[PDB]
Amino acid sequence: TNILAGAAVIKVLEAWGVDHLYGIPGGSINSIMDALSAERDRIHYIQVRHEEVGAMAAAADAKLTGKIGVCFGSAGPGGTHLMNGLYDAREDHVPVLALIGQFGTTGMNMDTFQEMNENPIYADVADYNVTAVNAATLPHVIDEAIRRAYAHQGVAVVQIPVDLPWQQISAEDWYASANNYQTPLLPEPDVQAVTRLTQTLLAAERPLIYYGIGARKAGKELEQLSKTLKIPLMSTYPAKGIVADRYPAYLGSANRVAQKPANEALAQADVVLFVGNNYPFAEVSKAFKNTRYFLQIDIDPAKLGKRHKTDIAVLADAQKTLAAILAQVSERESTPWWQANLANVKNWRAYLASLEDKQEGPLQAYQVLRAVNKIAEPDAIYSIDVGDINLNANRHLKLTPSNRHITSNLFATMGVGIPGAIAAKLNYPERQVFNLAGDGGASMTMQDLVTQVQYHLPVINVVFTNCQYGFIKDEQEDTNQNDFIGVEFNDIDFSKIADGVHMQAFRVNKIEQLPDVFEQAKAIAQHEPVLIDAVITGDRPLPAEKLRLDSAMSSAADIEAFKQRYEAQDLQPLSTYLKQFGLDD
Amino acid sequence: TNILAGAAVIKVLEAWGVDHLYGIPGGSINSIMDALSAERDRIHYIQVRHEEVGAMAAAADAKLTGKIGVCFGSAGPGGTHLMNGLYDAREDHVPVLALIGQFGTTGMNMDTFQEMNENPIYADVADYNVTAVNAATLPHVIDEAIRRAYAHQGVAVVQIPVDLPWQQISAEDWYASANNYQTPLLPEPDVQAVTRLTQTLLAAERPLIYYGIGARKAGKELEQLSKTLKIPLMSTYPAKGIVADRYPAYLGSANRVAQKPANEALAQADVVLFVGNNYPFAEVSKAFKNTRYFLQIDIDPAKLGKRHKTDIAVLADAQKTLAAILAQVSERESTPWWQANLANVKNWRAYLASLEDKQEGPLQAYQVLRAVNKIAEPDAIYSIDVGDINLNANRHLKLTPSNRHITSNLFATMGVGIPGAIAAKLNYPERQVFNLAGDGGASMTMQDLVTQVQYHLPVINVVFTNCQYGFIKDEQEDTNQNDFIGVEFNDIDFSKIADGVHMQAFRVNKIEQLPDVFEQAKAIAQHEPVLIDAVITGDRPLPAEKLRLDSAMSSAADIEAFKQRYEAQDLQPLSTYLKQFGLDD
Amino acid sequence: TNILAGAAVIKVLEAWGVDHLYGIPGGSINSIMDALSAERDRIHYIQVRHEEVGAMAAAADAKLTGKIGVCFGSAGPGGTHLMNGLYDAREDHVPVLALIGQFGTTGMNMDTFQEMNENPIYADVADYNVTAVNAATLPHVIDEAIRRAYAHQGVAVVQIPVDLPWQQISAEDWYASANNYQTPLLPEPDVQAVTRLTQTLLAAERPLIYYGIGARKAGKELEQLSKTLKIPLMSTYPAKGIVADRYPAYLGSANRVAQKPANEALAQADVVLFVGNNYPFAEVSKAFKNTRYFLQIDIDPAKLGKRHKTDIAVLADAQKTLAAILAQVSERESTPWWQANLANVKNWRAYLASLEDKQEGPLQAYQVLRAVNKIAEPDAIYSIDVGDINLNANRHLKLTPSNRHITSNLFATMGVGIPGAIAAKLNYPERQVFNLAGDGGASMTMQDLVTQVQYHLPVINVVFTNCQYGFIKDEQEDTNQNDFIGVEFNDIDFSKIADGVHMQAFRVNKIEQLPDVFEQAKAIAQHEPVLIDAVITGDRPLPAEKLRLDSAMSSAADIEAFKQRYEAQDLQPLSTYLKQFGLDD
Ligand SMILES: Cc1cc2nc3c(=O)[nH]c(=O)nc-3n(C[C@H](O)[C@H](O)[C@H](O)COP(=O)(O)OP(=O)(O)OC[C@H]3O[C@@H](n4cnc5c(N)ncnc54)[C@H](O)[C@@H]3O)c2cc1C
Ligand SMILES: Cc1cc2nc3c(=O)[nH]c(=O)nc-3n(C[C@H](O)[C@H](O)[C@H](O)COP(=O)(O)OP(=O)(O)OC[C@H]3O[C@@H](n4cnc5c(N)ncnc54)[C@H](O)[C@@H]3O)c2cc1C
Ligand SMILES: Cc1cc2nc3c(=O)[nH]c(=O)nc-3n(C[C@H](O)[C@H](O)[C@H](O)COP(=O)(O)OP(=O)(O)OC[C@H]3O[C@@H](n4cnc5c(N)ncnc54)[C@H](O)[C@@H]3O)c2cc1C
Ligand SMILES: Cc1ncc(C[n+]2csc(CCOP(=O)(O)OP(=O)(O)O)c2C)c(N)n1
Ligand SMILES: Cc1ncc(C[n+]2csc(CCOP(=O)(O)OP(=O)(O)O)c2C)c(N)n1
Ligand SMILES: Cc1ncc(C[n+]2csc(CCOP(=O)(O)OP(=O)(O)O)c2C)c(N)n1
């Protein structure tokens, strides 16, 4: 006969399969808390120490599983703390439901304590943004918000006056539509469009296949197409790992969180097949200014012809379309272009291994990442923060289709390393999970290291302490006329921070200390979280976008200073390999 | 002849007298950084570790000095991190200028990296919210934003595309209007309205004068009026300290961050003179349901008759109007009502002293605050966070007109203790500054303990570790039907957190440890920041809004359990004193 | 080599096939007017008399053709006048581009004449809402707006500083992606979900197929499935005409702009197949409270299970799914349910024909729509305003698949009759076009009757003058305790309004004047616009949602009065026909 409205709201979340959700209580959301408390055997509440970590972990849930993440904040400051995690979910287009506390309906608009019109605050980030005003329709409003966040891959926000979840409604006033749920229909490739695209692709002299995370279910077809037709592969940085990094013709990503072979090859390419890719640097970096033909495959009609004048655009699923190209082609023999790029990838990987393999001396970021590779399991998950770690992880981690890695891709909010790792261990308790974060990014969310201890989530946290905002210092070096400001700062000993939250931790500053510390860490993390604070040098990572290696384009003085600064004496420009195989630059 | 637009923007801030500002750099605000770097001898940049601390310190600057606070964030996540500090400035109505980074105008609306339409994000919090599009008008736009934030006591937000501060403009394209600045005109009291108000006030049998921070310049007239006419005084919690807490007829504040005498007297009063007061609990708690006449003094026409049916409302400056009442009255003799309230305040202060004066045993919050009182200088400044510390600081600190204390009053964002103390020490390097914060509030902004070390700001930080969100646990006790959830959590050793940021710290858990630790702390803080982590009991502070003391209204079983739980065996209800002097309840 | 940015913007519109666009000039949009002036041979500019008519005609263009409608307004008041047409496009989910004037970039944020931040004005209505700040990226921002408006079936708004279109840019700063636009090839519906839906529909004893405009391409399959399986059809009001109104088992629409058979049968049905339908009265009128199984076909995942607990929801195209069902069913012999419904429809249409066929007397709305039916061409287009005309046109117009009718379906803004008829005639100069509007609705946009004369658009305008807001008076009769207010008003003689804009017109008030006047109007509209002002009675149309015809549910006194008032003496309740074919109510 009757149920409390708050109890029916928790049953709609259970019907939709939500296992865990994040937040911090307050008087303005204590009736939802009361409903959660009764349901604690069926749905699991994760209490965080700052609400932005709860919204960031909810977005990381949806990034990892495809299932909607759920978080909440109390009225006023609880909900405004959620913003960096909600803009991350909007920009990385993943479904998140956020519930916002509000004063009871009898006190709304009376200007009472911590009571304000909360609806204008969430209007820009959310796909659906409503204040609930009736208890009997509140299960439907929650159901409606989840359906929309899934269908539209964005954020749904509901402000709930605290009195409505304590009202009784009838058990027939409500249902969940979770059993009717379906994912959007995938469009099929037009065969004539595929034939025309294939003919342009085969006629190319210097082809590249450039794919994003829209080609996630097509790693087999990508690799197979590359080796049948002898066409090198390059990706956006989030798409690393779709094709194994060891694959000999994988060039890496372009621009700054980039690898040298991809930047050099893109400038020479005559035809690019751009697949499931919304690379945000296309126009501002003039990435395709020398491309003769640009071919596109994407599921979304708003992306077709968006990033560059597009000669043939196919509106279709990436995997279905690459299976259709592959059904029309045959093995081609090796070309000068194929061989020139293979030799260039070999030269680059030998430069990265030489940085990784130093055995003694002052610790640099390169050897830390080599030690992570040594203890990493084949299906490890990586939550990466924002700064030089995106550049260094992209060059040094060796990923396969069995791994997962997540960061804040487009909004690029620092602080995501710790919440992403909490969400990862909750969803995959049996996989090894790492959190790789710079010292500026780990100190923004450092208080939630205690959430890994409190909920027994064994994460290997690795902090790269350079006592700098290193990614911004290198920008100021490049653009600013006056001296550095706001980029070098005081030390924080993170092994002491970890001790304060009662987590095991180590601090290291020499290359020869790494093997034993990472061995111990790997063993601790079978049961408990652990933190390694690696005190690294201030050395700038080689800028793949400002290469000074080619004598035809840089002075001998610039080239020698570049090689000395980046320990790059053995790198050769792509033009060397192009000339060995008879091609021009 | 020419100046860079970024250099002219920094000269407008210097003309307006800004000494320091807060933020974290990023590529999207590196041209403002470049201008700051050149001006580092004239204006001082405070680099924080999380941008919400920079916006909260900027609001605390304006709360302490009356001068506009200034903060900035880089594009996307830098600026959204500012929100809890910007909503605090809006709700506590203090002037703050926030500068938001944005991608260059050639890349805007291209959907490039970390580039979005940033103007809708700040539309609800700001009084002035504009994206600058021209370099020659940018000094004027900054000048315009400061004039408006001052005149309107709110937030001005300017989004600046990174290319405009690097453009050259002519040194005649700009001026600052800082030398024309004036504060708003104060309206004068109508003499007839003052006479009518005074006659109602003198005819009252049980009068109360109830004032807020709008009566800040009138503490002398408030005390003088109270003792000439024999009328007890009560205030809003922010107004504590306008009249010395030792004054015998100061009753305290009402509702929950309240003192028992003010709650008991307000329920009996027949006439209330409500002066410079916008108490947000008036209507929802039915605070004035028994008041016969309600008299109001305020400078703002939007507040007149707002909180209760008002019999005589005077639109005028609080001090001028109280000086005018005082010029029309003469000494009155003692009354039963005056004496009944004096005896009630005496009984209450003896209960607080008995909690404070325990000499040995398990540490409670009451003795920690007694030890703060013992080392506190007469003009100390207190930055207080949000939770039980507002209730306990309000009852136990003894303030005079020489002290200052700040918290987030109406938005009530946790985490303000640390940024408020940083702003206080920057503005008053010669005054002793304390940061009193609960463990849930101090862990939200704990990373910026390093900002007090880095900029050598000697703050005495006191953390009250109860391993609870104690203020929310007591609410769940009062309203929730099911068991506690999300309010008891794991320990964080804050003396270890402080060691990790290289600050001296102590952890204490017994009453007898306090005198020596606070003595050492007082000595360290002549030169360096120090932190005391006080591990306190989970005891609930006496709820002044749910008193069980009067036998006419509560059962003997409820009264005895109340006295035993709150160690309140010696408190007497106000009805005892009312009956001793011949009045009825 | 160079092109002005405004000339490249008009070339992006031409590339996307925009044939005409609407607006009113002003100083802040005169550089876009300058570029249109040069291209008047390729794109036709329609100067309207009030900018809301421009925005409403642009939404009617997209409703009729599926191509993006385009309108513009000058800064400040020109753009805010667009609002009722932009909300109609958002709510009726059709693509519209709106360009908004803005003061030059050198004067923005200077608080100069008619200059304000215009971006917050359009944030709620628009899917895409940006202020352009650079001339070289302006063609791309217009291309982006058009691609997003089509992909998201909504409104895109761009605010353009007037200086930017007069700046020179290179002929390759731009391209349009119109050539990449295409329709998705959708998968066939899964045969197992189709077979489950077919088996449930065949077992039903009292089935109904209830379709909306999502089944617009399935008129053949709806009609064939209906007569093969003997299942009556009912639709939403906008879906009228998908199956010819003369089809014997078409029941009409439900609720108030409704027909009696549909309302009575919906309350009796056991299984409802809900197809391409988002009927907004479902939950608030408990339309499906007696339904036993509810089956759904929709292409949008956000709609599955939205309107009622749904037993089987198939995500698929309506026409392909109904064709798949039709391919696996065979003839069912006539059932009792089928025959009771056919008898009920016959009785209802005899009632409507008796109102239409009155030959002398005071003119009512019913005989005016019979005269419209007599001169109507089989492919005529009807633009219908909002009010009793939706109810009357839904019952009396006899449409086929060759007709089109449009109104403001969900936002329901009055005044759409004239702009919809202007847009229809611009798109189809060879088709007969009607504007049917009540006197309240026609007077909101009456000034744009001159745009039909100025651009030589031969529309037949029929105004129903009752000197009332008749739709609202009947609501006040049903809900209001006190007397009618604001619903009866002064006469406007629209044949004199038409004469003032130099349009031929007639005013009629007698049933016997109709044949000659409508015969003359049909002939004038071969070359010129014409208006007929029909002065009608204030009789209330029969309320299909408040039927008092069944003795089992209404008293005989109520049934007598209902029959008398609505001239409904020969109408029978559906229960008569149920009992006649052996079914119980
Ligand atoms: C500090 C930092 C720096 C960065 N620097 C760079 C850099 O230098 N270089 C770099 O590469 N990246 C960089 N990134 C990441 C960058 O911001 C973008 O997020 C990324 O380049 C876009 O990747 P994507 O195209 O794979 O993903 P998305 O932007 O998510 O786009 C996915 C695309 O796939 C399409 N799609 C989806 N499903 C399908 C399907 N089934 N079939 C076909 N199409 C489909 C979608 O419609 C969309 O068009 C950086 C990130 C950070 C945090
Ligand atoms: C956790 C927490 C709990 C709280 N609980 C309580 C509680 O239980 N009880 C309580 O009292 N407070 C409480 N507060 C504070 C509360 O939220 C309000 O901020 C406070 O009660 C309002 O104080 P005010 O009226 O002094 O200040 P304001 O709201 O700032 O109002 C000032 C008033 O003075 C007027 N004014 C300004 N200048 C003049 C002048 N020159 N002449 C005359 N009028 C002038 C202004 O127009 C305005 O009307 C709490 C705060 C926190 C953080
Ligand atoms: C004065 C006034 C009163 C009104 N009163 C009534 C009334 O009493 N009764 C009434 O019926 N209406 C009434 N209306 C109209 C009403 O407001 C709604 O607009 C209408 O009922 C909804 O029609 P729809 O479901 O056909 O269209 P829409 O709301 O546009 O929905 C179309 C649906 O079809 C789906 N769809 C689209 N394409 C496909 C495809 N190819 N395959 C499958 N699914 C697809 C869409 O996803 C969507 O769910 C009134 C309007 C006015 C102006
Ligand atoms: C919340 C937030 N503030 C500011 C920025 C701008 N930003 C981008 S990278 C970076 C510095 C990263 O520092 P750190 O984590 O120490 O990494 P490092 O580069 O030193 O490895 C900053 C400040 C941002 N992306 N997010
Ligand atoms: C950012 C934010 N989140 C949530 C709240 C709700 N809230 C108000 S008081 C409180 C708990 C305070 O905890 P703590 O700092 O430990 O103080 P205690 O009461 O234990 O002394 C909370 C969560 C808030 N005001 N601000
Ligand atoms: C712009 C606008 N204002 C108000 C309404 C509310 N409304 C709905 S129907 C109606 C009256 C319709 O009057 P009229 O056009 O004379 O038609 P009638 O019903 O008299 O035939 C009104 C005011 C509306 N939909 N749109």
Ligand SMILES: [Mg+2]
């Ligand atoms: Mg760093």
Ligand SMILES: [Mg+2]
């Ligand atoms: Mg606490």
Ligand SMILES: [Mg+2]
């Ligand atoms: Mg009318």
Ligand code: NA
């Ligand atoms: Na923090």
